[PDB]
Symmetry: D2
Subunit: 328 residues, 4 copies
Amino acid sequence: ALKDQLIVNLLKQVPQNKITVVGVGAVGMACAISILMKDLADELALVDVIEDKLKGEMMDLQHGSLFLKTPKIVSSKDYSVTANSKLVIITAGARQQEGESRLNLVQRNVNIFKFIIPNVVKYSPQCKLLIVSNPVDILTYVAWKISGFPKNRVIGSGCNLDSARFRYLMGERLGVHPLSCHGWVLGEHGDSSVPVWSGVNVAGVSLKSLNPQLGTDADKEQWKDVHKQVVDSAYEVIKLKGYTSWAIGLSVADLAESIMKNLRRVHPISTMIKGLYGIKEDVFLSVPCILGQNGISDVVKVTLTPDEEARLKKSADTLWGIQKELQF
Amino acid sequence: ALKDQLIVNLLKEEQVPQNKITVVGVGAVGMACAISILMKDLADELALVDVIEDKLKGEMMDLQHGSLFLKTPKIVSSKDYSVTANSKLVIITAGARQQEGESRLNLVQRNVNIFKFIIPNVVKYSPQCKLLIVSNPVDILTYVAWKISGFPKNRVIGSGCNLDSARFRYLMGERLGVHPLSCHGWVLGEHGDSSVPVWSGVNVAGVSLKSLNPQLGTDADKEQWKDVHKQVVDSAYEVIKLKGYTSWAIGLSVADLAESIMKNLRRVHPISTMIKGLYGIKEDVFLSVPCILGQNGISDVVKVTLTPDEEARLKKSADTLWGIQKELQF
Amino acid sequence: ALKDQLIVNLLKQVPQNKITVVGVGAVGMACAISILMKDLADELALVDVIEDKLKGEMMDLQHGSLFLKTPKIVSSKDYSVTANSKLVIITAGARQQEGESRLNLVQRNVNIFKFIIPNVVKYSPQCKLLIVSNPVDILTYVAWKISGFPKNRVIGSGCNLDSARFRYLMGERLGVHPLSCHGWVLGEHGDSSVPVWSGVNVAGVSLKSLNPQLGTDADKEQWKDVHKQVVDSAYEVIKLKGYTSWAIGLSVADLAESIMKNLRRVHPISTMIKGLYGIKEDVFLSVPCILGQNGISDVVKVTLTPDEEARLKKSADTLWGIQKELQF
Amino acid sequence: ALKDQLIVNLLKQVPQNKITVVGVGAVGMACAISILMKDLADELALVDVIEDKLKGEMMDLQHGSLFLKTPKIVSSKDYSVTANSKLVIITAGARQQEGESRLNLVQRNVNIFKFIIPNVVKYSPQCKLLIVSNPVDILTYVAWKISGFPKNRVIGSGCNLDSARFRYLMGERLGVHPLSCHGWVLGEHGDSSVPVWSGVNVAGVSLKSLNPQLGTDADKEQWKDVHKQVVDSAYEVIKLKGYTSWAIGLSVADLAESIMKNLRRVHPISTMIKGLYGIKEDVFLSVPCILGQNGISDVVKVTLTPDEEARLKKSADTLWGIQKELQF
Ligand SMILES: CCNC(=O)NCCC(=O)Nc1ccc2nc(C)sc2c1
Ligand SMILES: CCNC(=O)NCCC(=O)Nc1ccc2nc(C)sc2c1
Ligand SMILES: CCNC(=O)NCCC(=O)Nc1ccc2nc(C)sc2c1
Ligand SMILES: CCNC(=O)NCCC(=O)Nc1ccc2nc(C)sc2c1
């Protein structure tokens, strides 16, 4: 053979930094291209239930291999293809229509997770689970209960995107890059999210100390419209292009980088909140977490104003109202 | 104002970007080009143009929302070409795309008509830009953009066979158990059915695969390496059949070309350019040959030493393209 | 000729993203490798007065070109080599010995700047001047006076590194990546620098709000020692390895990135502060600045406590006293 | 404590992609900075015998942590700091001197390896060893013999740099980026290196097909002078700046990238050549190897002309002559 004329084999194949993306819809493929372009993995595996679509997506990424540093890209409906993953990203399930809450996807997606989650853990016992499908906070709780994994290893993309949207809008109003505009959107990745105005700052300068009316209806510059734009973002983009993909793709690759490179950066992501802010139930929602190689190792206790804390508890209550009725 | 309480302004800046890129067409190809360029930190400004207002705004917003994770501080869009002003590079990914089983050549009149509106609008706002054609049939549309723009030929580049060659190197890599970066091989001529695999130049570590197998790429080849070129030709049709279109690979291929232009690299790429004066071609035919690509576009052409059969295939590719090119109404 | 047999020339220029580094000592070379590895420039020029050392450094960088994306690396004792730079980085001059203040370097470095500055500005109409040599704040005032440039174009590396050191040390104490530890060291890049305790935070949570005694002598955890370690850092590193290079090289490449990519990120860098905190003279020192393609376009007005403001005015008085010793 | 007031700890720490650099001279520190800037490791360990120098270098790197994505930088004279390294890079020993062959360092470097190698293997028995110390080809054989490792895990940086230098020089003559100028320099990383003119090409076009006398004495354009410049490069750089560092650091980081990311790229690096080109002894020298996570898995069999083969056998004979009389 030509290969044997050209190459003398001297050694008789396990990946060290494998990532799996489950679900090849627009979200899944945006996560895949973003991870591929951040050189986070030595192996990328894709999984879906639509055979042709799955093979087409895999081939299209494979054909870009010359321009990447991920030497193996594979796919299958069979979960054996996901074996030995360090990180498994779940982007499978129904997505919200225009005028539909992420909360309305819960029954369809819990039922899908009942199949996906045990199959993922069967082949990747050392992985961290990164939940992206909606409603993310409830689905992170669901994946945790199903997986048998400790809670540090089951992470929801949560408010990492809401916070990036908030920082972009703030940056645009101020003429400062989003990197230098600090601001946290916490709670549900959805309608009941909480903008933490008390912590909004540039170079440690509290914007609320300069303008006490910040984020209230009495604010002359209406900064509450910034949070409203954050809440409405997915709806607005869905109305315009039919779905969202790029921003969530980059937000998930951001979380994947902190995990794969054990950075211990702080992210507002879905985790168990029981024990904080008087929350007594197994509610999962976004709070700033330290994220690394073992997932969520620590939770930051944000000092919230009385109104911010009440809003966060109201967000926990909304999530509990849906979660408490789940059968799985 | 809160901005004023927080910040003292020192001066009113010119605000003209220094590394601006425009992507015309926000379909799946255009958006894959946009994301790949954003993730490669090639531009200080990204502008998007299309004729579908809602889809254009939705795409711009979705990229903008990921700004925190990027290093491109301004992302804008409009149906109006004033949004594209002062672009260093303008990437054209607008027009009809191949349906399942459709030749890229079938898109020619629909895309020439669209180019009649697009090209003058681009040139009006960025008279010094490099034009990078991605729309199909790429080779003929690079000729069309060249003629319409009035630009010198160095500033009108077609993505050509950069992707075909990347597909060839991936497939070769898979057969040899080597990364595609260490597998060398060139696919020339039309970015389509008449492309030419240059078997005589296919190598790993400078070892000619044809020197080990003299029947390489022929019908008499026991390993049927010609099937690698057939897979290259069929790739887009196969991906279209499975997912409905192609995007990732062309997006990565366009960003690779954008990188050589924006960073004045002077790397060699098989891209669409005028081949008149080479291989006995007497006409203004545009097709892929290896070109040195930099800040001024195509500054030089590599003269590939083709075998008589390879040269015959390249002239056949030239004949097919010229047949359509010579009769264009614009 | 073989080149003409292989290549048909089709076209008959000017660099678009050129950077010059003046000084090929350990600092200058650390800036050069950091800039090369960050893909910030299409051309890199080096300038020094020692012919052999300069040529040797240029050649060693050129030999790594295959692994880089900067296609032209050049050098000369003649400033015509720096023509058409967008950014000129000054790392020339005497360095402090153990037990020697950076302020003691003033007369030697001013004399050198009287030659370098007019020669640099002559060939690059669009350049920003980035001063690294010490005392950086004083030398930024000096480069500003000699060049006749507007203040937005004359920047001192200032406290960008002091703040990076502060954030690293804070990160170590908290088990958090420095990227998620926020805190500002302002004023002189030296002994009189000011840690802005009021702005020190993780996820928008003020550390001073949790420990009102933070940074004071009454602090049980002695966070003031973190600022003392920042002040002493260069001297500790000098005593150990003889000089410092890597951290400053990275700090300067971070500033070069904001400039070259027009990021508009906020950095604590040397600029004129006349008109803020009761300062009435042309004092240069570090304050949070928005940095982009036109240099410093905007200054953030940090809200300081009376004690922090008094420490910042003390630093300004120190620097102004040295400025009064300058002979142009 | 402030940390406990701020953060709720949920989880009480082994690196997954650790690299150790042994030797903190100019070569070692250039490897370290290049590896840090390429985001190849989650932990970097430094080892040397000069305690102050070692601590100063580690601190200087640590201070730039905010600008990097390698969260743990550690050092010690004690090899326990190197535990669980995936890759251990040896840069220690006597360095090439002005007007002196790299072969002049052999005995002293063999003696040093008798200490280093058992210490490295004790703490990371499954690492890949990357030898950079000179004479690299003989020291790779030495490291292989002392370590007891299988030959795939003992790699010499070999001719990866000589080939990068060759491609830079070819690129300058042709007006093409070195990435698009292909050519291999094999054999000894030193005076007896072999330029493979038969494989030298641009876009698959053999330069020898355009100039049959390419690289010979009869070559009208005297391309042999390019290989002479490759051979002389370290002697010239040493004469000018005292040592070489930047290019070798980038060449080593290029090899570290292929190992750490399992790229299976082809590199001209030091491996056992017994059984090829009539070589019957345990000689190590550069031939094009496939490099990945298990080190050298395969060797490309280059079709050398009779001239090129005789030149490679001579390089093998020069190395065996020295190696034969070692004792260890
Ligand atoms: C995150 C937004 N949602 C999407 O992008 N959804 C489209 C992709 C998708 O749902 N794939 C998929 C994959 C696996 C799978 N296993 C089952 C038992 S059903 C199923 C469905
Ligand atoms: C390359 C594959 N083609 C696609 O991705 N096509 C979809 C996007 C597209 O065609 N946009 C667009 C943009 C401008 C424009 N100007 C006109 C007069 S028509 C027109 C259409
Ligand atoms: C910041 C730490 N300082 C250093 O790294 N200094 C060493 C490098 C150095 O001083 N170069 C240099 C360059 C130009 C020049 N022009 C003159 C009239 S004197 C002179 C000296
Ligand atoms: C490649 C050029 N060589 C250099 O840069 N060398 C300087 C650094 C150096 O030799 N370190 C060092 C480290 C460990 C060690 N263990 C021993 C028993 S001796 C010894 C010496």
